[PDB]
Design a protein around this ligand. Structure first.
Ligand SMILES: CC(C)(C)c1csc(NC(=O)c2ccn3c(=O)c(/C=C/c4nnn[nH]4)c(N4CCC[C@@H](OC(=O)NCC[N+](C)(C)CC(=O)[O-])C4)nc3c2)n1
Lengths: 1033, 147, 98, 49, 98
């Protein structure tokens, strides 16, 4: 074929024109996001029961929705929270590769039939099902500079004139809104109320009467009466539209022809919907959008486009309405890309340099420089051919292949200079025989390296998807190379490659270039019979091997593992947990201090603090917060003391001066759904009606018994909340009867006062918006305030709760957890410094097996993935090995000679893990594919060597011991050139710190040192193998 | 089938608010499965310590849910009934104390309820409120005895 | 029986604003009369598989729904694949005024 | 759905339950149309060997 | 097309923030136009490339490609004075002339 292409020159040019022209049409139109999609898809169901405690939520709403997720295809598990803030969320995780669009439809449907059972008030708020994809593209914030506009003021504006504009800018997937638009707020006064003999039920009603909108009819309605001139629409009642109009609402007429308005019995401002979360930004009233990325959009693209839309709203803003960007994935992705496209440019230049310094001439060294950029542009086609995308993970493929992409190219062009100076044949005709020696040694490179990568895109689970990301990229770039080398490069050798006379070498020249082939030729010889020395007594050397086969095997298992290195991503955040019962205000105080420690102790790094009070990340409570700290550019933050594992220390340390409030700052992983490299996820399950208390015991048993094996298990903690006190206002039924007081009247009076109640809607500035009635905050703060609230009895008399009820404190649980529909408790922890995540698991199960009967356990999340799919490599690669042998045998028509290629595996391995160990790193994915391209080069160098030796033996019938010296001899130069290139091309990563360093570091530092020993060591070894392996049968 | 079921149900929802309220409270259901039993799982006591009644209840409250929820299970029929608070009226007594079943019902509604009672320290609060706790009112009864 | 402005504001919008992040959405157009009646139409790029298209819409619909007036939810709101012109028109007459 | 696969899963879910029943309560298998489909296929893989 | 292009003119001379768009029937025609250029462009590029592979030249193609403009003009004429239009069918015609 390269023969057919050595002749046909333009055919091999056309093909090339296409390929780049294809992967160019594809480069310059293909999705860019930071990562792809690793986590199995999962739909979440959410609901508010305004005012409900955790049990109420749980027994009137959660259990019902749960009893109903049936005949929904591909569920893995189903967990759910029921919180004392009236909140309930239920998440269902599906099989990997389930259609998220179907799963969410099915759920959404099965809900739609359970709604007839949920409480009216829940139905009113509405339940709601969405897909989970908590990877925000960016987060705009919106401050007022004047200090005029409240949280609620600002959020309204955003929800009014911005949210939709952004909602629609091409590329966006989802828009959340930090606040709500306004809501009409009737704020009740039990006293005003108790004057005019009124319940809030009364307020509730009048509002419904006098804010409804009413069907009318229409003048000259069809069927008309014969002979008709007019047809028009009658307009009856519609909806109040102002706090004014609202206050005007009539409520009662007392004996004396008197008139009681609504404003007469309450305040009527125009607040927000939910007063639970307080977020401000660098201390000032805030709000704004978390924008996510539509599936298959362009991060960089939509990212700009969204700035674009903001821009053109900024004129029309009110008095001092600044816009701020505490998060934008984009800076990182750009920088991540500008740093990879560079590693690509860099490598090309270094190949130009290592050829011109070994073959010497702007021709031979212009060959791979216009051939690799063909393969790469061509991967971006077969990449886009499987709908992939340019993301951190595919970009680190192909620049992890670059080594295999050159060894492919170099070794053709070099194998031409070799015969075109040893038999001194011409240009065109010299390139045959050159590529009759390498033909199926490249077409075995193909089938062998397939076997080393492909079986990677087979690992089950989440991490499974990462491996695919590489596994395709590599094989896609790789097989496309072994093609370019069969087609364009042979054709490029024999066209820009001026002949060299049998022996031209350059052993005498007017410069350095002379000295090179001079002192290279010395060193060629200096080494070739050094191999020769080895060959007589070889058993001394198999001992160095057997103590390298163990060398890795001693390490490797000593090496710690993980998934993905963190990076200084630009933001980081601080936790804040004030204890049981602490309030919104107490919590805010603490956030302020945290905002201070950053805006002082740290200016120079912190660019802003987004602090959210009410939403902590282990709950929604008055007693929890979170602060989102965005930093100044990587540029202005030089050295380990301006990056993040640093600033974190000075805060996490710094935050033990806060006596009340558990407050730890920390850093987000690369992929947000990763979960600790060594963390397990354990569910304790109530399996026979046991009840909260009994489970809580069980839990503690296990949790106490757990924390007395620090040998193996650290930080075994409960993920949920501790029980707490709650004020129970039990009604005497009998009593209420007697006095003529209707339970429902009682109930909603209290509920309305203390919980609030969405009444109906009204229209504000052409916008439908909620209307809530709820007691002004002064009459609803402490148990003694109950006093103020009068219900009305059968006979018109005003009656207080002491008449017919009693109070009493008790324990609670403000959060109730359930796994697979049974009640549960989430236990987290890790295997103790030294052990494996699997051993911890193993132990935990054994500790659990000893609990009271009716208590069960089950693993989830990370630890569920792992329990199923994380054991495969042994099993898997067994089948790769079997195909590496079978590929090799075929190539070498030998049931045995393959053996001398395969035994080169550990040689790379060792230098690779060596460099990770004496450098403080982890056996992770970036290191792990490294290990594969390193097995990859070292097997395909050993392919060509054990090829040549096998040939001059069947071709010429040369010496078993002499063909080898000849094989080694001629194949020595390529090896060196390629590996000089590689080892220099990896240099720039291996030191890199700053914007995305850990990424860079992990791929480099493992491959570089493994290239050193794979090479500066297989020189001696591969011929040692061939000899020993041949003389076995 | 996925889609068929999806479409089927888009139409059904249209009619939903026309069914009688009591029809909806039982839940209309839209399955898609083979007409025929794939298999039947039996469950017996062997101590004679549980009744027919009992086992039908174990099974419903403790096994049904997951089988129903299990990918591939299109439908699950169960050979019995899960328990229920059973108020077996007597028309004589009712007439003695001069009450109809309406009363019993209106009673049970009022007196077997779970309500939402807001919070002490209700956001939005008053300056410097320091305590915050749930209010708890009536909650669904849970024994024959309480009924 | 609601005036268009009334309807426009409380139905149409609420739906519309939720009609985002629908793959291959090419464009949408909606209109709302005085008889009280709304017709949102979403058109897609050719290629788009209409049954998945339908699904995505019902999915976003959902999120709007609870937000719309009660009597709207009463009336049903339908989500279906469409087309602007009749294949045909069977008609029907009597020939003897019975 | 695949009958054989769905039968597998029903069994193994049922395994997760059993450790926690009241005493006495045994699961029994009064009727199943999988172990034939399974057994059947085998006697053919046999006549094929 | 003309009728459309007149309109676009009259459009751009209106109050500000009162923009316009083309939908349905129209929107598909506009899109037909915009892609014609690229349609003939890459179409040629392929033929050029298909011939170079073929007659091993670089010039045999580069000479054939010069014959294209002559077949077109006659095509153009045959409609230009037949009262016809550069509708969709023509653009197929043109790729067939090539
Ligand atoms: C994680 C990552 C990517 C590194 C990052 C970088 S920056 C950032 N996020 C922020 O900087 C930020 C800044 C302010 N926030 C907020 O102010 C709120 C809450 C705002 C609010 N809503 N009503 N009043 N104030 C919030 N959520 C707080 C929890 C609710 C989530 O979704 C909503 O915005 N929905 C509003 C409805 N409520 C609040 C009622 C929650 C519900 O789910 O029922 C997100 N998240 C945020 C998040 N995240």
């Amino acid at each position: 074929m390269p023969n057919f292409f050595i002749d046909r020159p333009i055919f091999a040019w056309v093909i090339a024109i296409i390929i780049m022209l294809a992967g160019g049409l594809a480069i310059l139109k293909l999705p860019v996001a930071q990562y792809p999609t690793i986590a199995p898809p999962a739909v979440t169901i959410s609901a508010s029961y305004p005012g409900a405690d955790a049990k109420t939520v749980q027994d009137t709403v959660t259990q019902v929705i749960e009893q109903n997720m049936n005949g929904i295809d591909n569920l893995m598990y189903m967990s759910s929270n029921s919180d004392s803030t009236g909140t309930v969320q239920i998440t269902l995780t599906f099989e990997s590769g389930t259609d998220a669009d179907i799963a969410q439809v099915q759920v959404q449907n099965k809900l739609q039939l359970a709604m007839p059972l949920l409480p009216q008030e829940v139905q009113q708020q509405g339940v709601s099902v969405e897909k989970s994809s908590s990877s925000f593209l960016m987060v705009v914030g919106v401050i007022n500079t004047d200090g005029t506009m409240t949280q609620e003021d600002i959020s309204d504006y955003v929800a009014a004139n911005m949210k939709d504009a952004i909602s629609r800018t091409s590329g966006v997937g989802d828009v959340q809104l930090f606040g709500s638009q306004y809501a009409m707020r009737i704020w009740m006064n039990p006293n005003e109320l108790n004057k005019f003999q009124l319940t809030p039920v009364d307020v509730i009603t009048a509002i419904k009467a006098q804010n409804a909108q009413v069907a009318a009819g229409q003048l000259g309605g069809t069927p008309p009466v014969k002979g008709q001139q007019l047809n028009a629409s009658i307009i009856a009642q519609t909806r109040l539209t102002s706090t004014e109009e609202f206050g005007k609402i009539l409520l009662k007429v007392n004996q004396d022809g008197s008139r009681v308005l609504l404003r007469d019995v309450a305040k009527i401002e125009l607040g927000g919907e939910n007063y639970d979360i307080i977020a401000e930004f660098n201390g000032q009233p805030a709000s704004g959008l978390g924008i996510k990325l539509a599936t298959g959009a362009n991060a960089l693209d939509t990212a700009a486009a969204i700035r674009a839309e903001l821009a053109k709203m900024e004129p029309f803003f009110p008095s001092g309405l600044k816009i701020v960007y505490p998060y934008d994935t984009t800076p990182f992705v750009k920088i991540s890309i500008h740093e990879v496209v560079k590693t690509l440019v860099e490598a090309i230049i270094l190949v130009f340099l290592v050829m011109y310094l070994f073959l010497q001439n702007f021709r031979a060294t212009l060959i791979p420089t216009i051939a690799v950029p063909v393969v790469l542009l061509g991967t971006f086609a077969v990449l886009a051919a499987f709908g992939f995308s340019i993301n951190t993970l595919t970009m680190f493929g192909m620049v992890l292949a670059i080594g295999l992409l050159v060894d492919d190219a170099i070794v053709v062009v070099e194998n031409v200079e070799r015969v075109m100076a040893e038999e001194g044949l011409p240009p065109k005709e010299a390139t045959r025989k050159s590529m009759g020696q390498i033909q199926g040694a490249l077409v075995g490179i193909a089938m062998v390296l397939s076997a080393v990568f492909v079986p990677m895109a087979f690992f089950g689970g989440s991490t499974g998807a990462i491996y695919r990301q590489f596994s395709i990229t590599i094989v896609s770039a790789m097989a496309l190379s072994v093609l370019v080398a069969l087609i364009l490069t042979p054709a490029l050798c024999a066209t820009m490659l001026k002949p060299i006379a049998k022996g031209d070498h350059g052993e005498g020249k007017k410069g350095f270039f002379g000295w090179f082939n001079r002192m290279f030729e010395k060193s060629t010889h200096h080494y070739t019979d050094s191999v020769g020395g080895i060959l007589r007594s070889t058993g001394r050397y198999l001992v160095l091997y057997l103590i390298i086969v163990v060398g890795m095997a001693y390490l490797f298992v000593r090496l710690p593992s993980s998934f993905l290195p963190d990076e200084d991503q630009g933001v980081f955040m601080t936790m804040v947990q004030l204890p049981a019962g602490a309030t919104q205000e107490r919590t805010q105080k603490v956030l302020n201090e945290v905002t201070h420690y950053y805006l002082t102790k740290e200016k120079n790094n912190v660019e802003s603090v987004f602090a959210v009070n009410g939403f902590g990340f282990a709950g929604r409570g008055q007693n929890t917060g979170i602060a989102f700290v965005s930093l100044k550019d990587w540029a202005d933050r030089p050295g380990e003391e301006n990056k993040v594992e640093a600033i974190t220390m000075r805060a996490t340390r710094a935050f033990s001066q806060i006596k009340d409030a558990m407050v730890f700052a920390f850093n987000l992983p690369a992929i947000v759904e990763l979960g600790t490299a060594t963390g397990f996820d354990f569910e304790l399950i109530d399996q026979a009606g046991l009840g909260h208390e009994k489970l809580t015991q069980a839990r503690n048993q296990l949790l106490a018994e757990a924390a007395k094996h620090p040998d193996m298990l650290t930080s075994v903690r409960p993920n949920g909340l501790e029980d707490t006190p709650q004020f129970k206002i039990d009604i005497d039924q009998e009593k209420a009867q007697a006095l003529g007081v209707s339970i429902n009247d009682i109930n909603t009076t209290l509920g309305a006062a203390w919980g609030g109640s969405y009444v109906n809607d009204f229209i504000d500035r052409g916008r439908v918006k909620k209307v809530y009635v709820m007691s002004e905050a002064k009459y609803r703060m402490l148990p003694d305030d109950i006093g103020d609230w009068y219900v009305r009895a059968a006979d018109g008399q005003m009656v207080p709760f002491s008449a017919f009820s009693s109070s009493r404190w008790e324990y609670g649980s403000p959060r109730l957890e359930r796994y697979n529909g049974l009640p549960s408790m989430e236990i987290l922890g890790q295997a103790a410094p030294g052990k494996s995540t699997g051993e911890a698991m193993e132990l935990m199960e054994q500790l659990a097996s000893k609990l009271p009967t009716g208590v069960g356990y089950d693993w989830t999340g990370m630890s569920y993935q792992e329990r199923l799919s994380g054991n495969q490599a042994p099993s898997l690669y067994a089948i790769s090995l079997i195909v590496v042998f079978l590929c090799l045998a075929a190539l070498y028509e030998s049931w045995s000679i393959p053996f001398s290629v395969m035994l080169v595996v550990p040689l790379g391995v060792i230098g690779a893990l060596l460099a990770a160990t004496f450098r403080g790193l982890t056996n992770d994915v970036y290191f792990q594919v490294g290990l594969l391209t390193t097995i990859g080069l070292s097997a395909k160098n050993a392919i060509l060597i054990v090829e040549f030796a096998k040939d001059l033996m069947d071709k010429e019938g040369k010496g078993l011991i002499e063909a080898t010296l000849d094989a080694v001899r001629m194949r020595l130069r390529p090896i060196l050139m390629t590996s000089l290139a590689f080892i220099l091309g990896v240099m720039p990563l291996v030191i890199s710190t700053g914007a995305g360093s850990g990424a860079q570091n992990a791929v480099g530092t493992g491959v570089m040192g493994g290239m050193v020993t794979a090479t500066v060591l297989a020189i001696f070894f591969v011929p040692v193998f061939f000899v020993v392996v041949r003389r076995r049968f």
